[PDB]
Scaffold this active site. Structure first.
Site, PDB file in Angstrom:
ATOM      1  N   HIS A  40     -12.099   0.356  -3.598  1.00 33.78           N
ATOM      2  CA  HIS A  40     -12.496  -0.975  -3.146  1.00 33.78           C
ATOM      3  C   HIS A  40     -13.928  -0.995  -2.623  1.00 33.78           C
ATOM      4  O   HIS A  40     -14.463  -2.086  -2.369  1.00 33.78           O
ATOM      5  CB  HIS A  40     -11.481  -1.513  -2.108  1.00 33.78           C
ATOM      6  N   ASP A  84      -6.373   3.650  -4.368  1.00 37.37           N
ATOM      7  CA  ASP A  84      -7.688   3.265  -3.838  1.00 37.37           C
ATOM      8  C   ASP A  84      -8.602   4.488  -3.784  1.00 37.37           C
ATOM      9  O   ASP A  84      -8.901   5.044  -2.725  1.00 37.37           O
ATOM     10  CB  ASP A  84      -7.535   2.637  -2.456  1.00 37.37           C
ATOM     11  N   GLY A 175     -16.150  -0.652   7.598  1.00 36.39           N
ATOM     12  CA  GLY A 175     -17.352   0.157   7.494  1.00 36.39           C
ATOM     13  C   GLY A 175     -17.077   1.642   7.397  1.00 36.39           C
ATOM     14  O   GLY A 175     -17.986   2.408   7.051  1.00 36.39           O
ATOM     15  N   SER A 177     -14.424   2.614   5.429  1.00 33.29           N
ATOM     16  CA  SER A 177     -13.748   2.741   4.132  1.00 33.29           C
ATOM     17  C   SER A 177     -14.458   3.705   3.203  1.00 33.29           C
ATOM     18  O   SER A 177     -15.688   3.745   3.152  1.00 33.29           O
ATOM     19  CB  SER A 177     -13.654   1.397   3.420  1.00 33.29           C
ATOM     20  N   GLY A 178     -13.667   4.457   2.443  1.00 33.50           N
ATOM     21  CA  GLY A 178     -14.190   5.449   1.527  1.00 33.50           C
ATOM     22  C   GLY A 178     -14.435   6.806   2.147  1.00 33.50           C
ATOM     23  O   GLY A 178     -14.571   7.797   1.410  1.00 33.50           O
TER      24      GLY A 178
END
Ligand SMILES: [Ca+2]
Length: 223
Positions: A40, A84, A175, A177-178
């Site tokens: 995402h 994801d 912020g 995420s990933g």
């Protein structure tokens, strides 16, 4: 990261910042040419920033390398965030050193109770917003599947794990995420989603990396 601490400089050397004009997601360096992040977090143009501590100031250990390939999992579901996960091939290899380093993929899935380290430059407040210059760190345990499904009924697939605290107060947030969840030297989680941040009975939900080792290795080998 809400309720964490400021990491020591370059103590998370696999942590990268994805930048498209500003920081917008984290990622993890897994070999000199490849970063794993969240699907995402996809954008069509991405600069990977390695060796960062203060993301607002040039400190001297940074490497800025553009993303050449950006490959989301073919079964990524943008509605549920199932699968994801995303791979980025750097346009040139990073120079590996004490401050820019890879993290191992998992040799097996992590058991509930396993202690992990979560990191990122995301929001540090559970109400409102405050985005830090310095990388933030949080120690947190893997939660049982039943606890995670109780926290999020009908939303936790077999490709998701919860990591954090049912009492709230300490969590990842927007912020982050990933970015990485690393347990016993292995990347077990990718910051994916949650309900608010650091809310009671709403721990963070993370992509279960141990389900994707084969996909990661085959994608890297083929590209
Ligand atoms: Ca910097």
């Amino acid at each position: 990261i809400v309720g964490g601490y400021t990491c020591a400089a370059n103590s998370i050397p696999y942590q990268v910042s994805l930048n498209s004009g500003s920081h917008f997601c984290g990622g993890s360096l897994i070999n000199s040419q490849w970063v794993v992040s969240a699907a995402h977090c996809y954008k069509s143009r991405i600069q990977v920033r390695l060796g960062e501590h203060n993301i607002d100031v040039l400190e001297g250990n940074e490497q800025f390398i553009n993303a050449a390939k950006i490959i989301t999992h073919p079964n990524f579901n943008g509605n549920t965030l199932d699968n994801d996960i995303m791979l980025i091939k750097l346009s040139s290899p990073a120079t590996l050193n004490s401050r820019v380093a890879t993290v191992s993929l998992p040799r097996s899935c992590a058991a509930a109770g396993t202690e992990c380290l979560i990191s990122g430059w995301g929001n540090t407040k559970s109400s409102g917003s405050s985005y830090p210059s310095l990388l933030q760190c949080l120690k947190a345990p893997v939660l049982s599947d039943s606890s995670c499904k109780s926290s999020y009924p009908g939303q936790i697939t077999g490709n998701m794990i919860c990591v954090g605290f049912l009492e709230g107060g300490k969590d990842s947030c927007q912020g982050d995420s990933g970015g990485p969840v690393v347990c016993n030297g292995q990347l077990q989680g990718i910051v994916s989603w949650g309900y608010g941040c650091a809310q009671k009975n709403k721990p963070g939900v993370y992509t279960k990396v141990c389900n994707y080792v084969n996909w990661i290795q085959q994608t890297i080998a083929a590209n």
